[PDB]
Design a protein around this nucleic acid. Sequence first.
DNA 1: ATCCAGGTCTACC
DNA 2: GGTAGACATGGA
Length: 291
Amino acid sequence: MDFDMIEEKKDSVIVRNVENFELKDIFDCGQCFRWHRQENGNYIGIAFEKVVEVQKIGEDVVIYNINEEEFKNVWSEYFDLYRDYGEIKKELSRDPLLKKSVDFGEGIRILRQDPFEILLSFIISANNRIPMIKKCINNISEKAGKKLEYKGKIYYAFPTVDKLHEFTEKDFEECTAGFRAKYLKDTVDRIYNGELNLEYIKSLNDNECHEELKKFMGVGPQVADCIMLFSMQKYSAFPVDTWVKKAMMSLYVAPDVSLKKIRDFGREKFGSLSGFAQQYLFYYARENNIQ
DNA sequence: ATCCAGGTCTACC
DNA sequence: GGTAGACATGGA
Ligand code: NA
Protein backbone atom coordinates (compact mmCIF):
# COMPACT_ATOMS: atom_id res chain seq x y z
CA MET A 1 0.00 0.00 0.00
CA ASP A 2 1.53 3.33 -1.07
CA PHE A 3 -0.38 5.46 1.46
CA ASP A 4 -0.92 5.51 5.25
CA MET A 5 -4.52 6.50 5.91
CA ILE A 6 -7.31 8.77 4.71
CA GLU A 7 -9.30 11.62 6.20
CA GLU A 8 -12.84 12.21 4.96
CA LYS A 9 -13.56 15.91 4.51
CA LYS A 10 -16.80 17.71 3.66
CA ASP A 11 -16.38 17.63 -0.12
CA SER A 12 -13.17 15.64 -0.46
CA VAL A 13 -10.90 12.90 0.88
CA ILE A 14 -7.28 13.38 1.92
CA VAL A 15 -4.93 10.47 1.33
CA ARG A 16 -2.04 10.75 3.80
CA ASN A 17 1.64 10.04 3.10
CA VAL A 18 1.36 8.88 -0.49
CA GLU A 19 4.55 7.56 -2.09
CA ASN A 20 5.44 7.21 -5.79
CA PHE A 21 2.63 9.53 -6.84
CA GLU A 22 3.12 12.61 -9.04
CA LEU A 23 0.22 14.16 -10.95
CA LYS A 24 2.12 15.06 -14.12
CA ASP A 25 3.67 11.57 -14.28
CA ILE A 26 0.33 9.80 -13.78
CA PHE A 27 -1.94 11.89 -16.00
CA ASP A 28 0.49 12.81 -18.79
CA CYS A 29 2.38 9.54 -19.30
CA GLY A 30 0.03 8.58 -22.13
CA GLN A 31 -2.29 6.09 -20.42
CA CYS A 32 -5.33 8.33 -20.03
CA PHE A 33 -7.28 10.85 -22.08
CA ARG A 34 -9.88 12.49 -19.85
CA TRP A 35 -7.66 14.21 -17.27
CA HIS A 36 -6.97 17.92 -17.73
CA ARG A 37 -4.30 19.98 -15.98
CA GLN A 38 -5.62 23.08 -14.26
CA GLU A 39 -3.91 26.46 -14.04
CA ASN A 40 -2.94 25.71 -10.43
CA GLY A 41 -1.41 22.33 -11.17
CA ASN A 42 -4.43 20.30 -10.09
CA TYR A 43 -6.01 17.86 -12.53
CA ILE A 44 -9.71 17.36 -13.17
CA GLY A 45 -10.84 14.12 -14.73
CA ILE A 46 -13.95 12.19 -15.69
CA ALA A 47 -14.10 8.46 -14.97
CA PHE A 48 -16.70 5.94 -13.86
CA GLU A 49 -19.47 8.51 -14.31
CA LYS A 50 -17.84 10.88 -11.81
CA VAL A 51 -15.97 14.17 -12.01
CA VAL A 52 -12.96 14.24 -9.69
CA GLU A 53 -10.23 16.79 -8.99
CA VAL A 54 -6.82 15.79 -7.67
CA GLN A 55 -4.29 17.95 -5.87
CA LYS A 56 -0.90 17.00 -4.46
CA ILE A 57 0.44 18.97 -1.50
CA GLY A 58 3.68 17.68 -0.06
CA GLU A 59 3.24 14.01 0.84
CA ASP A 60 -0.55 14.25 0.73
CA VAL A 61 -3.07 13.87 -2.08
CA VAL A 62 -6.46 15.56 -1.94
CA ILE A 63 -9.21 13.96 -4.01
CA TYR A 64 -12.13 16.37 -4.36
CA ASN A 65 -15.75 15.37 -5.00
CA ILE A 66 -15.62 11.90 -3.43
CA ASN A 67 -16.24 10.41 0.01
CA GLU A 68 -14.64 7.61 2.02
CA GLU A 69 -16.99 4.92 0.70
CA GLU A 70 -16.13 5.87 -2.89
CA PHE A 71 -12.41 5.92 -2.14
CA LYS A 72 -12.57 2.36 -0.83
CA ASN A 73 -14.74 0.90 -3.59
CA VAL A 74 -13.49 2.87 -6.59
CA TRP A 75 -10.69 5.40 -6.35
CA SER A 76 -8.16 3.58 -4.19
CA GLU A 77 -7.99 0.92 -6.92
CA TYR A 78 -8.29 3.46 -9.74
CA PHE A 79 -4.97 4.98 -8.65
CA ASP A 80 -3.57 1.48 -7.99
CA LEU A 81 -2.82 2.51 -4.40
CA TYR A 82 -2.52 -1.04 -3.06
CA ARG A 83 0.58 -1.75 -5.14
CA ASP A 84 4.03 -0.81 -3.83
CA TYR A 85 5.69 0.98 -6.74
CA GLY A 86 8.90 1.30 -4.77
CA GLU A 87 9.45 -2.43 -5.31
CA ILE A 88 8.57 -2.16 -8.99
CA LYS A 89 11.09 0.63 -9.52
CA LYS A 90 13.73 -1.15 -7.45
CA GLU A 91 13.42 -4.28 -9.58
CA LEU A 92 13.41 -2.42 -12.91
CA SER A 93 16.29 -0.17 -11.86
CA ARG A 94 18.54 -3.22 -11.55
CA ASP A 95 18.76 -2.78 -15.33
CA PRO A 96 21.04 0.25 -15.92
CA LEU A 97 19.45 0.88 -19.30
CA LEU A 98 16.04 1.50 -17.70
CA LYS A 99 17.29 3.66 -14.85
CA LYS A 100 17.13 7.03 -16.64
CA SER A 101 13.52 6.41 -17.70
CA VAL A 102 12.47 5.22 -14.27
CA ASP A 103 14.13 8.27 -12.67
CA PHE A 104 12.31 10.53 -15.13
CA GLY A 105 8.89 9.08 -14.36
CA GLU A 106 9.29 8.12 -10.71
CA GLY A 107 5.74 9.17 -9.88
CA ILE A 108 4.00 7.07 -12.53
CA ARG A 109 1.22 4.69 -11.48
CA ILE A 110 -0.81 2.56 -13.88
CA LEU A 111 -4.45 3.54 -13.43
CA ARG A 112 -7.13 0.85 -13.30
CA GLN A 113 -9.52 2.17 -15.95
CA ASP A 114 -12.82 0.95 -17.40
CA PRO A 115 -12.45 -1.75 -20.09
CA PHE A 116 -15.23 -0.46 -22.37
CA GLU A 117 -13.96 3.13 -22.37
CA ILE A 118 -10.34 1.99 -22.83
CA LEU A 119 -11.25 -0.39 -25.67
CA LEU A 120 -12.79 2.43 -27.70
CA SER A 121 -10.20 4.99 -26.61
CA PHE A 122 -7.27 2.98 -27.93
CA ILE A 123 -8.96 1.92 -31.13
CA ILE A 124 -9.12 5.69 -31.67
CA SER A 125 -5.42 6.00 -30.76
CA ALA A 126 -4.14 4.07 -33.80
CA ASN A 127 -1.87 6.27 -35.95
CA ASN A 128 -3.28 9.30 -34.11
CA ARG A 129 -2.03 12.12 -31.88
CA ILE A 130 -3.00 12.36 -28.22
CA PRO A 131 -4.63 15.81 -28.52
CA MET A 132 -6.89 14.52 -31.29
CA ILE A 133 -7.60 11.33 -29.35
CA LYS A 134 -8.70 13.38 -26.33
CA LYS A 135 -10.96 15.54 -28.50
CA CYS A 136 -12.65 12.53 -30.07
CA ILE A 137 -13.27 10.84 -26.71
CA ASN A 138 -14.71 14.04 -25.23
CA ASN A 139 -16.93 14.56 -28.30
CA ILE A 140 -18.30 11.04 -28.04
CA SER A 141 -19.04 11.70 -24.36
CA GLU A 142 -20.69 15.07 -25.01
CA LYS A 143 -22.82 13.50 -27.73
CA ALA A 144 -24.31 10.69 -25.63
CA GLY A 145 -22.99 10.73 -22.07
CA LYS A 146 -24.71 11.57 -18.79
CA LYS A 147 -24.42 15.16 -17.52
CA LEU A 148 -22.25 15.70 -14.44
CA GLU A 149 -21.88 19.00 -12.58
CA TYR A 150 -18.73 20.23 -10.84
CA LYS A 151 -17.79 23.76 -9.74
CA GLY A 152 -20.13 25.50 -12.17
CA LYS A 153 -19.34 23.44 -15.25
CA ILE A 154 -21.16 20.53 -16.86
CA TYR A 155 -19.01 17.51 -17.72
CA TYR A 156 -20.10 14.45 -19.69
CA ALA A 157 -19.57 10.87 -18.56
CA PHE A 158 -18.46 8.31 -21.14
CA PRO A 159 -21.58 6.82 -22.83
CA THR A 160 -23.13 3.52 -21.78
CA VAL A 161 -22.96 0.57 -24.16
CA ASP A 162 -26.66 1.04 -24.98
CA LYS A 163 -26.20 4.71 -25.86
CA LEU A 164 -23.11 4.07 -27.99
CA HIS A 165 -24.91 1.32 -29.90
CA GLU A 166 -27.16 4.11 -31.24
CA PHE A 167 -24.19 5.67 -33.04
CA THR A 168 -23.99 5.25 -36.80
CA GLU A 169 -20.60 5.21 -38.51
CA LYS A 170 -21.36 8.81 -39.42
CA ASP A 171 -21.89 9.74 -35.76
CA PHE A 172 -18.38 8.52 -34.93
CA GLU A 173 -16.98 10.40 -37.94
CA GLU A 174 -18.63 13.57 -36.61
CA CYS A 175 -16.90 13.10 -33.25
CA THR A 176 -14.15 12.47 -35.74
CA ALA A 177 -12.65 9.03 -35.47
CA GLY A 178 -11.84 9.35 -39.16
CA PHE A 179 -11.40 5.96 -40.83
CA ARG A 180 -11.62 4.39 -37.36
CA ALA A 181 -15.36 5.13 -37.23
CA LYS A 182 -16.23 1.79 -38.83
CA TYR A 183 -14.05 -0.01 -36.28
CA LEU A 184 -15.80 1.69 -33.38
CA LYS A 185 -19.23 0.83 -34.76
CA ASP A 186 -18.33 -2.80 -35.43
CA THR A 187 -16.80 -3.09 -31.96
CA VAL A 188 -19.74 -1.53 -30.12
CA ASP A 189 -22.06 -3.90 -32.02
CA ARG A 190 -20.08 -6.95 -30.90
CA ILE A 191 -20.16 -5.77 -27.29
CA TYR A 192 -23.87 -4.96 -27.45
CA ASN A 193 -24.91 -8.30 -28.94
CA GLY A 194 -22.63 -10.23 -26.59
CA GLU A 195 -20.33 -11.66 -29.27
CA LEU A 196 -17.34 -10.62 -27.14
CA ASN A 197 -17.59 -10.18 -23.36
CA LEU A 198 -15.16 -7.76 -21.67
CA GLU A 199 -15.62 -9.10 -18.13
CA TYR A 200 -14.85 -12.59 -19.39
CA ILE A 201 -11.86 -11.38 -21.41
CA LYS A 202 -10.50 -9.51 -18.39
CA SER A 203 -10.52 -12.76 -16.37
CA LEU A 204 -8.23 -14.55 -18.86
CA ASN A 205 -4.48 -14.90 -18.35
CA ASP A 206 -2.25 -12.35 -20.11
CA ASN A 207 -1.66 -14.21 -23.39
CA GLU A 208 -5.22 -15.46 -23.83
CA CYS A 209 -6.61 -12.02 -22.95
CA HIS A 210 -4.36 -10.48 -25.63
CA GLU A 211 -5.61 -12.93 -28.26
CA GLU A 212 -9.30 -12.32 -27.53
CA LEU A 213 -8.84 -8.54 -27.67
CA LYS A 214 -7.34 -8.74 -31.14
CA LYS A 215 -10.62 -10.22 -32.34
CA PHE A 216 -12.04 -6.68 -32.22
CA MET A 217 -11.79 -4.71 -35.45
CA GLY A 218 -9.27 -1.90 -35.09
CA VAL A 219 -7.36 -3.75 -32.38
CA GLY A 220 -3.90 -5.08 -33.17
CA PRO A 221 -0.93 -6.17 -30.97
CA GLN A 222 -0.22 -2.65 -29.69
CA VAL A 223 -3.81 -1.59 -29.02
CA ALA A 224 -4.55 -4.96 -27.41
CA ASP A 225 -1.58 -4.55 -25.04
CA CYS A 226 -2.72 -1.04 -24.09
CA ILE A 227 -6.21 -2.26 -23.37
CA MET A 228 -5.23 -5.21 -21.21
CA LEU A 229 -2.60 -3.17 -19.39
CA PHE A 230 -4.71 -0.10 -18.68
CA SER A 231 -8.07 -1.75 -17.98
CA MET A 232 -7.34 -5.41 -17.22
CA GLN A 233 -4.11 -5.25 -15.21
CA LYS A 234 -2.24 -7.75 -17.42
CA TYR A 235 1.23 -6.47 -16.61
CA SER A 236 3.21 -8.70 -18.99
CA ALA A 237 1.77 -6.50 -21.75
CA PHE A 238 4.33 -4.50 -23.75
CA PRO A 239 2.58 -2.09 -26.16
CA VAL A 240 5.03 -1.07 -28.87
CA ASP A 241 3.95 2.22 -30.45
CA THR A 242 6.18 4.71 -32.25
CA TRP A 243 7.66 6.01 -28.98
CA VAL A 244 8.38 2.68 -27.31
CA LYS A 245 9.92 1.57 -30.61
CA LYS A 246 12.28 4.56 -30.48
CA ALA A 247 13.14 3.89 -26.84
CA MET A 248 13.93 0.23 -27.56
CA MET A 249 16.05 1.06 -30.61
CA SER A 250 18.04 3.47 -28.47
CA LEU A 251 18.76 0.89 -25.78
CA TYR A 252 18.15 -2.72 -26.83
CA VAL A 253 17.58 -3.39 -30.53
CA ALA A 254 18.77 -2.50 -34.03
CA PRO A 255 16.78 -0.10 -36.30
CA ASP A 256 15.52 -2.85 -38.63
CA VAL A 257 13.87 -5.09 -36.02
CA SER A 258 10.12 -5.63 -36.48
CA LEU A 259 7.57 -4.45 -33.92
CA LYS A 260 6.64 -8.07 -33.15
CA LYS A 261 10.28 -8.87 -32.39
CA ILE A 262 10.54 -5.79 -30.17
CA ARG A 263 7.41 -6.83 -28.27
CA ASP A 264 8.74 -10.35 -27.75
CA PHE A 265 12.14 -9.01 -26.68
CA GLY A 266 10.62 -6.71 -24.08
CA ARG A 267 8.24 -9.30 -22.66
CA GLU A 268 11.07 -11.81 -22.36
CA LYS A 269 13.36 -9.32 -20.62
CA PHE A 270 10.91 -7.56 -18.29
CA GLY A 271 8.45 -10.40 -17.69
CA SER A 272 5.61 -9.61 -15.29
CA LEU A 273 6.83 -6.01 -15.06
CA SER A 274 6.78 -5.39 -18.82
CA GLY A 275 3.82 -3.02 -18.73
CA PHE A 276 5.52 -0.84 -16.14
CA ALA A 277 8.83 -0.85 -17.98
CA GLN A 278 6.91 0.18 -21.10
CA GLN A 279 5.30 3.18 -19.41
CA TYR A 280 8.56 4.58 -18.06
CA LEU A 281 10.12 4.14 -21.52
CA PHE A 282 7.16 5.74 -23.35
CA TYR A 283 6.99 8.74 -21.04
CA TYR A 284 10.73 9.47 -21.22
CA ALA A 285 10.86 8.99 -25.00
CA ARG A 286 7.88 11.20 -25.82
CA GLU A 287 8.57 13.98 -23.31
CA ASN A 288 12.19 14.30 -24.43
CA ASN A 289 11.21 13.75 -28.07
CA ILE A 290 14.09 11.33 -28.61
CA GLN A 291 15.19 10.91 -32.24
C1' DA B 1 5.40 19.85 -48.79
C1' DT B 2 6.40 15.18 -46.96
C1' DC B 3 6.07 13.18 -42.70
C1' DC B 4 4.36 11.92 -38.29
C1' DA B 5 1.18 10.60 -34.68
C1' DG B 6 0.10 5.65 -28.72
C1' DG B 7 -1.34 1.17 -35.88
C1' DT B 8 -4.44 -1.75 -38.20
C1' DC B 9 -6.53 -3.87 -42.19
C1' DT B 10 -6.01 -5.89 -46.59
C1' DA B 11 -3.65 -8.22 -50.20
C1' DC B 12 0.16 -11.07 -51.10
C1' DC B 13 3.69 -14.47 -51.00
C1' DG C 1 3.89 -16.29 -40.56
C1' DG C 2 6.47 -11.92 -42.52
C1' DT C 3 5.85 -7.30 -45.69
C1' DA C 4 3.86 -2.56 -49.12
C1' DG C 5 -0.27 0.40 -49.63
C1' DA C 6 -4.48 2.35 -47.93
C1' DC C 7 -6.80 4.50 -44.41
C1' DA C 8 -8.64 10.31 -41.91
C1' DT C 9 -7.00 14.22 -39.48
C1' DG C 10 -4.17 18.23 -38.39
C1' DG C 11 0.21 20.02 -36.71
C1' DA C 12 4.80 21.04 -37.88
NA1 NA D 1 -8.28 -6.95 -34.71
